[PDB]
């Protein structure tokens, strides 16, 4: 019971660690528009003129 419970918590804490690494990796992946070419390369942010 102590062994299986240990293996159980091992997986969870490993999952938490791995997942938390991903939330910071993706947090860096996000890039903000720096030029016009950035408006054409993406579609999430709509844009227009007069």
Binding site for another protein (CB under 8 A): 1, 3-5, 7-8, 10-12, 14-15, 17-19, 21-23, 25-26, 28, 30, 33
CA 45, CA 32: separation in Å to the nearest integer?
Answer: 11
Least Å distance, CB 50 to a copy of itself, is: 23
The two three-digit tokens of residue 21, written as one number: 């690494």
Residue with tokens 């950035």, as numbered in its chain: 38
Is 2 or 48 the residue whose CB approaches a copy of itself more closely?
A: 2
9 or 47, CB closer to another protein? 9
């Amino acid at each position: 019971v102590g062994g299986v419970w240990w293996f159980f918590t091992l997986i969870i804490i490993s999952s938490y660690t791995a997942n938390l690494a991903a939330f910071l990796t993706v947090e860096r992946m996000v890039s903000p528009i720096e030029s016009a070419e950035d408006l054409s390369k993406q579609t999430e942010i709509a844009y227009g003129t007069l």
